[PDB]
Design an enzyme around this catalytic site. Structure first.
Site, PDB file in Angstrom:
ATOM      1  CG  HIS A  93      -6.408  -5.583   1.753  1.00 38.28           C
ATOM      2  ND1 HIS A  93      -5.850  -6.438   2.680  1.00 38.28           N
ATOM      3  CD2 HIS A  93      -7.602  -5.199   2.260  1.00 38.28           C
ATOM      4  CE1 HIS A  93      -6.672  -6.550   3.712  1.00 38.28           C
ATOM      5  NE2 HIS A  93      -7.743  -5.811   3.479  1.00 38.28           N
TER       6      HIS A  93
ATOM      7  CG  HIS B 106      -1.947  -1.044   1.271  1.00 44.74           C
ATOM      8  ND1 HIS B 106      -2.866  -1.267   0.267  1.00 44.74           N
ATOM      9  CD2 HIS B 106      -2.176  -1.992   2.210  1.00 44.74           C
ATOM     10  CE1 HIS B 106      -3.622  -2.303   0.590  1.00 44.74           C
ATOM     11  NE2 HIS B 106      -3.229  -2.755   1.767  1.00 44.74           N
TER      12      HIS B 106
ATOM     13  CG  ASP C   9      -2.490  -8.434   0.974  1.00 42.35           C
ATOM     14  OD1 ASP C   9      -3.574  -7.827   1.035  1.00 42.35           O
ATOM     15  OD2 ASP C   9      -1.728  -8.552   1.966  1.00 42.35           O
TER      16      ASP C   9
ATOM     17  CG  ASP D  59      -4.544 -10.048   3.619  1.00 43.34           C
ATOM     18  OD1 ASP D  59      -4.196 -10.533   2.518  1.00 43.34           O
ATOM     19  OD2 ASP D  59      -4.337  -8.843   3.918  1.00 43.34           O
TER      20      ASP D  59
HETATM   21  O1  LIG Z   1      -2.652  -4.318   4.773  1.00 40.12           O
HETATM   22  C1  LIG Z   1      -3.781  -4.608   5.124  1.00 40.12           C
HETATM   23  N1  LIG Z   1      -4.198  -5.961   5.125  1.00 40.12           N
HETATM   24  O2  LIG Z   1      -3.180  -6.734   4.671  1.00 40.12           O
HETATM   25  C2  LIG Z   1      -4.792  -3.658   5.598  1.00 40.12           C
HETATM   26  C3  LIG Z   1      -4.597  -2.294   5.529  1.00 40.12           C
HETATM   27  C4  LIG Z   1      -5.556  -1.414   5.993  1.00 40.12           C
HETATM   28  C5  LIG Z   1      -6.763  -1.813   6.554  1.00 40.12           C
HETATM   29  C6  LIG Z   1      -7.761  -0.780   7.021  1.00 40.12           C
HETATM   30  N2  LIG Z   1      -8.204  -0.751   8.423  1.00 40.12           N
HETATM   31  C7  LIG Z   1      -9.138  -1.616   8.982  1.00 40.12           C
HETATM   32  O3  LIG Z   1      -9.666  -2.521   8.351  1.00 40.12           O
HETATM   33  C8  LIG Z   1      -9.516  -1.469  10.415  1.00 40.12           C
HETATM   34  C9  LIG Z   1     -10.510  -0.556  10.788  1.00 40.12           C
HETATM   35  C10 LIG Z   1     -10.880  -0.404  12.115  1.00 40.12           C
HETATM   36  C11 LIG Z   1     -10.253  -1.181  13.087  1.00 40.12           C
HETATM   37  N3  LIG Z   1      -9.297  -2.073  12.769  1.00 40.12           N
HETATM   38  C12 LIG Z   1      -8.960  -2.193  11.464  1.00 40.12           C
HETATM   39  C13 LIG Z   1      -7.866  -3.245  11.297  1.00 40.12           C
HETATM   40  F1  LIG Z   1      -6.700  -2.960  11.912  1.00 40.12           F
HETATM   41  F2  LIG Z   1      -8.281  -4.398  11.829  1.00 40.12           F
HETATM   42  F3  LIG Z   1      -7.527  -3.520  10.041  1.00 40.12           F
HETATM   43  C14 LIG Z   1      -6.956  -3.196   6.622  1.00 40.12           C
HETATM   44  C15 LIG Z   1      -5.996  -4.103   6.156  1.00 40.12           C
HETATM   45  K   LIG Z   2      -3.717  -8.114  -4.088  1.00 42.07           K
HETATM   46 ZN   LIG Z   3      -3.870  -7.152   2.906  1.00 38.54          ZN
END
Ligand SMILES: O=C(NO)c1ccc(CNC(=O)c2cccnc2C(F)(F)F)cc1
Ligand SMILES: [K+]
Ligand SMILES: [Zn+2]
Ligand SMILES: [K+]
Length: 357
Positions: free
Chosen positions: A173, A133, A171, A264
């Site tokens: 995302h 990201h 990933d 993930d």
């Molecule tokens: O790189 C990533 N995945 O690989 C990745 C990056 C950004 C996010 C965005 N934020 C949230 O989803 C979120 C919101 C509220 C509370 N907690 C969270 C948590 F920490 F659990 F993600 C998720 C995953």
């Molecule tokens: K991806």
């Molecule tokens: Zn991710």
């Protein structure tokens, strides 16, 4: 036929001072490493040392301003750390974050160098914080510097500028940072599979849709495979690899394959909501090993169920070591939206890849 492995517990020092239970845990990398030991995979690998990326190396993909800001955080009191972190989308920072991000990148540089000089055939990098990201000018989504993007450019710097690098980002995302960094580049082919939900999934941008095919001389060299309305798993990822990833990758003929290997999308992940199995990831790895004369580097991105990511990444290393693929489950018919997604990507990239016609 040697498989490299890089792991350095110094990368555990990056941590969330205000929420010690935040899913991007220090123990992500130690648990993956432990599982390799437990399965007696570690002793089958050649250990590659970690090192710091230099600031000159970071500048291969990142602005001097962004480098300087993250660098300055090493000396900040917690009040700047919290406030600086809150300036980004989904970032926490500790005094050790910058150095850990440097070690993640340098670990991957050393691994690419060992692959490209023939010291190892392939390699796995158990690193954090993640990278995909991270943008040229900003941190995002637990990522400070774009490790995979940096490694692609580092690879070119020690071979030739036009070295064909494929980045497969599985990933769950979208790797917004890597897409943008290479969006105008035909030497680095970016293929991402990701949960999209019509933009209703992090990072919440229509940039991740299938019609973003690249720009300028990079048209055709950005492949987004976006999933909507379905708990995707092995059958969908296998179908995406059969119909899209592997035909396009073979036509591109990469000289180095980097996997932005988040786990993930795995069964059990608390954020991704998908059900790719460890044997699924093994099959995806085994397929990519048929490219670039086996020169594959697997780079940890996301993945937050400690048991899932440890089993999943270990199975990937088992494939790099030459073990036979485990048997997949019977494989249900695709989720119908998965067929819709695959066909949209096929229509979007038919203009550029003859293997899709
Ligand atoms: O790189 C990533 N995945 O690989 C990745 C990056 C950004 C996010 C965005 N934020 C949230 O989803 C979120 C919101 C509220 C509370 N907690 C969270 C948590 F920490 F659990 F993600 C998720 C995953
Ligand atoms: K991806
Ligand atoms: Zn991710
Ligand atoms: K590209």
């Amino acid at each position: 036929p040697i498989t490299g492995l890089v792991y350095d517990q110094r990368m555990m020092l990056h941590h969330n001072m205000w929420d010690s239970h935040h899913p991007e845990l220090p123990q992500r990398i130690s648990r993956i490493f432990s599982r390799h030991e437990e399965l007696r995979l570690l002793s089958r690998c050649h250990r590659i040392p970690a090192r710091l990326a230099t600031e000159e190396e970071l500048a291969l993909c990142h602005s001097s301003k962004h480098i300087s800001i993250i660098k300055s955080s090493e000396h900040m009191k917690p009040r700047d750390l919290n406030r600086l972190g809150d300036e980004y989308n989904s970032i926490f920072i500790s005094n050790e974050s910058y150095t850990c991000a440097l070690l993640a990148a340098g670990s991957c540089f050393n691994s690419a160098q060992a692959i490209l000089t023939g010291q190892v055939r392939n390699a796995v990098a158990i690193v954090r914080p993640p990278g995909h990201h991270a943008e040229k000018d900003t941190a995002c989504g637990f990522c400070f510097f774009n490790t995979a993007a940096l490694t692609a450019r580092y690879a070119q710097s020690i071979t030739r500028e036009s070295l064909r690098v494929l980045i497969v980002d599985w990933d769950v995302h979208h790797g917004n940072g890597t897409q943008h960094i290479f969006e105008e580049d035909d030497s680095v082919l970016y293929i991402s599979l990701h949960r999209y939900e019509d933009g209703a999934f992090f990072p919440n941008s229509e940039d991740a849709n299938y019609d973003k095919v690249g720009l300028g001389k990079g048209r055709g060299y950005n492949v987004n495979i976006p999933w909507n309305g379905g708990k995707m798993g092995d059958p969908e990822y296998m179908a995406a690899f059969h119909h899209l990833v592997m035909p396009i990758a073979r036509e591109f003929a990469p000289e180095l394959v980097l996997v932005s290997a988040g786990f993930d999308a795995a069964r059990g992940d608390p954020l991704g909501g998908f059900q790719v199995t460890p044997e699924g990831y093994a099959h995806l790895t085994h397929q990519l090993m048929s490219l670039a004369a086996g020169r594959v580097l697997i780079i940890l991105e996301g993945g937050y169920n400690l048991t899932s990511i440890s089993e999943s990444m270990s199975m990937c290393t088992s494939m790099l070591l030459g073990d036979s693929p485990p048997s997949l489950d019977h494989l249900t018919p695709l989720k119908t939206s998965a067929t819709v997604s695959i066909n949209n990507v096929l229509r979007a990239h038919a203009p550029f890849w003859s293997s899709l016609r």
